[PDB]
């Protein structure tokens, strides 16, 4: 639910859009996330590992 549960009720959202909003929040348009979504997710795993 992203940040929606912190401010009140938990509102479900697909994780890729949650990432899209967080990208928009730092000055990077959401199409950047969507165009590179697969790259970003695989890349995320190496960072967690």
């Amino acid at each position: 639910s992203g940040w929606t549960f912190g401010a009140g009720p938990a509102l479900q959202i697909p994780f890729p859009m949650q990432m899209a909003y967080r990208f928009n929040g730092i000055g990077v348009t959401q199409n950047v996330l969507y165009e590179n979504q697969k790259l970003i997710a695989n890349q995320f795993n190496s960072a967690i590992g």
Binding site: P16, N31, Y34, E35, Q37
Partner: peptide, 17 residues
């Protein structure tokens, strides 16, 4: 884009002109 839906987008110019 993943899961992009095949949906129409309205244009405010063609109905006007």
């Amino acid at each position: 884009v993943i899961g992009i839906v095949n949906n129409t987008v309205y244009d405010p110019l063609q109905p006007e002109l």
